[PDB]
Write a protein that binds this ligand. Structure first.
Ligand code: HEM
Ligand code: HEM
Ligand code: HEM
Ligand code: HEM
Lengths: 160, 160, 160, 160, 160, 160, 160
């Protein structure tokens, strides 16, 4: 089914946004793992794998609309150099993604592409979910303090 | 453990090579799925997920050597526009990767980084495995013919 | 139990014939596997393992008759360079073996070695079984055609 | 993948070495069985089947490197005429094989064929394992004495 | 079905041969048991029960051919007075039986009694099996020596 | 199999290094247990038992090469007097061991002792694994702080 | 609980005695394994692991009494060069240990350290157990003779 050229552009931009999130979360997972914050690390791994799912879903929609998925580049990565910074960087990436999705979503509605519109409403919904979580974690980070938060998310020497 | 600067460079190049393979295989999976060649598609999905594993393994080694993993860019993608071309493109990517790995591997040996050396020997071994498979598939493609090969790797209308 | 010198000669010739078949079938298995004709390959592997059994059985009979089993040489191998040729080469080897077994069998009867005679009748029976199969496969090969036969005996990319 | 002509030569020589071991072990199994040394016989059968595995593995590597596996001939067989001699003959064959493998292995390294190199390191490792075992058995043979060793490896009249 | 008078004669002679073997094996079982060679004894018991089966099979064939089975007498028994002698006596009895069976077998063939012929081929086959075993045991006896062989086939004081 | 005198020297040095690690880890386990840091203690016990395995493996290789394993002495022990010091002492011991293994490993390669070489590559790989872990733990120790780290690795009064 | 300085000295001497036994038994296990005396070897492995338990128990008591466990040295090792010698060397080590334990035990009683006293009574009891066993084995060794004993404790070629 031939799709609206601009909807395809939006989908490809969202895809690039996702590919960026995937790598950012995965690096954070690895980084957090090496810091000994296993519990924080597992969450990052999960979020990265969630984005992989979004990316796949989007690539399929692009092909169906007869466009060409472009995974050649990523937007700028934001790698935190510490526990709190990674939360900040991930949150920063979510806000940019939500901005982009709300925009794409409005355009899909205007052009009448119902299915593509709902995909963005679904993505918007998932991203607000991550935002909710990160905000709660950042809030808990300040309340507990650097050491306390690290303790809560660290693994004992005899773990796994 | 501080690592040899050039070993880290090689690891980051191998990582970029892998991130490229991951996306190339995934696009091929999606493309093959839309062509109705489900069986060919599932194989591509598997190979893409194998590369994801390699990438993760490499990022961890980089962090351990105290380097910084860089997933900001991918090498040029090779997207086939048909069944046979995708096999060709994937095979082309394997040869470039093997070339790079044999090079990195020699350098690790020369510098004495035993563990990093074996990682490249492991990657070289896996890639020769994929090459073996692709060559057999390309050979089978020419023997069966375009239609015959597509038939062998297609899914009936009542599938899954 | 001391056996008839010539029966032992026949047994050693049959053994050499079998050792030849074992290797011919095994190479064909490997060759067919690399061609992507897995189903054809599995049959060759089975036949090779059947011959291994015959060989073992014959070596035991030779030792019992107090002779010396000689596995130092094989008769000329017939390696096909393609699907149909391998069927032809295997069929060619069966005919030579049957010829030899019918001869040995008559001699065992003449000399009165009942048990050795039945072993050759058993071998003759198994070989006629393989001949039956190969003839049916060759016939099916011509009916289906090169591509069709290869298709029927090929494995999909997502196999095993 | 086209391979180095000399690596293929080495692989075919190793193959010939293995085909030789297979038959030597199998004859020893049969011989030992007729002597009533069932326990010694079962070990020989196992070792013969191990070599069969090595041979298969090597034939596959040869085909992948686009060479032609040659199973037409075997190196000279060494058939012991008694319990201790068979141990000696098998040990003699191991030393020749190890010599050949260490040589092939060095060449693979020099030419940079990593995978083929590791195959020879794997074979070298397995062969040193058999050598270890045989040396321990020969040592135990002299300590126990001909009759004692035969007793330890013999089966009672009511066995199996 | 009225049978050939001479085939019936042969069957009755074979029967007498078997009734003889049954008792010879059973006495040997008992003797060996009293000597404390339980493992040697169990084998003799098994062989005796095998012959019982042969005898039954033969009596049935005789009745079918409308002849009269005669179990009134046995051929001369051969009772060994020691471990090795019993093996010798049993082996001596096998050779006489095989001689008789090969003779009966030829006659059945000449007269065209197919079924009776195969019975003798079956008996010949079983007897060569026992001969094979006994020869291996006698060989093992000389290799191990009187004491060693007795040890291998003896039961500990706390057995069964 | 007679081995290279100097390879045996290296193996015995590696053995001494391992016997040292075994006792150092075990004392640390006991010490940490008495401090109430059960989780830290269990990890030390595991590492000590890992080294026991290495030691056994090395003693076996020495005997095979016909050398004489020498477990009469240990290198200087490094007993920490507190949580962080034990991590430091264990890390210090790993670096010395890696130094020794890389040296032995190069020599095995030079002399062509393939199997012994791989044992050192295996040991080097395991030790880099422990180093990775200890570095992550030391890093986590400074991030959490003395009290926080002790808390994370301590057992409640109602434990086990 | 601060302990009697001399009790701690005795405990550390007993510890050194045990660390010595551990290594002596383990070397004997390995040696016996290479000789092909698997059954004798498994017993040595068990005894070595028993001593490991004693050592651990003693180190814990030392720490509780606020002393410092010293595993830096071992008493002189006694490595037998043959089956019977290893039994002799192990027995020699037991007698020295018992001598030391009876001495430490008396001192603990005199000073009133009840718990430490019972530990030595427990060790004395276990050691007399090993002595009982070794004496029975040495006696059985002379009764059976070198070859007979080796036979009883050897493993067949098809073992494990
Ligand atoms: C940044 C590089 C990537 C890394 C490090 C990575 C890592 C992983 C790993 C190791 C898994 C296996 C499941 C598990 O570990 O629990 C996984 C699964 C998956 N990845 Fe990736 N991945 C990467 C990129 C991608 C991208 C860009 C795509 C394709 C568009 C993708 C799509 C998927 C999907 C859909 C799964 C789920 C598979 C399943 O569980 O059935 N991944 N990835
Ligand atoms: C020289 C004469 C040979 C004899 C008498 C012999 C005997 C045997 C026997 C009795 C089996 C039958 C299956 C079983 O026991 O489970 C076996 C298995 C096997 N043989 Fe042979 N063999 C011979 C040669 C070979 C050759 C030339 C190859 C390949 C180049 C080979 C490779 C194997 C393999 C891979 C198996 C394993 C089957 C499995 O576990 O799936 N054999 N052989
Ligand atoms: C000469 C003295 C014989 C002795 C001491 C003897 C001993 C034995 C023993 C102890 C059994 C009892 C069942 C069992 O153990 O399970 C057995 C089974 C048997 N005997 Fe005999 N037997 C003798 C003669 C015969 C004869 C003359 C025949 C037939 C002509 C014969 C045929 C059989 C058969 C067919 C069985 C198998 C039963 C079954 O498995 O269903 N036996 N015999
Ligand atoms: C001198 C060299 C030593 C060697 C070669 C050695 C060997 C072994 C082996 C192979 C194990 C591994 C686990 C298993 O087999 O299940 C074991 C277990 C054990 N070892 Fe050692 N060991 C040595 C020294 C020690 C020392 C110094 C101690 C303590 C002071 C010790 C205490 C133990 C304990 C308590 C276990 C029992 C594990 C359990 O059952 O939970 N070992 N040792």
């Amino acid at each position: 089914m031939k799709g609206d050229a601009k909807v395809i552009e939006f989908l490809n931009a969202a895809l690039r946004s996702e590919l960026t999130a995937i790598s950012q979360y995965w690096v954070h997972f690895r980084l957090q793992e090496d810091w000994g914050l296993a519990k924080m690390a597992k969450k990052s791994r999960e979020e990265s794998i969630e984005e992989m799912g979004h990316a796949d879903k989007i690539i399929a929609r692009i092909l169906f609309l007869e466009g060409h998925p472009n995974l050649q580049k990523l937007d700028p990565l934001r790698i935190g150099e510490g526990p709190r910074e990674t939360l900040e960087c991930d949150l920063a990436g979510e806000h940019d993604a939500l901005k982009l999705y709300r925009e794409a979503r409005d355009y899909c509605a205007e052009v009448g592409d119902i299915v593509s519109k709902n995909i963005f409403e679904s993505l918007i919904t998932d991203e607000e979910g991550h935002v909710d979580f990160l905000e709660t974690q950042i809030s808990l980070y300040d309340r507990l303090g650097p050491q306390g938060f690290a303790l809560l998310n660290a693994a004992p020497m005899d773990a796994a």
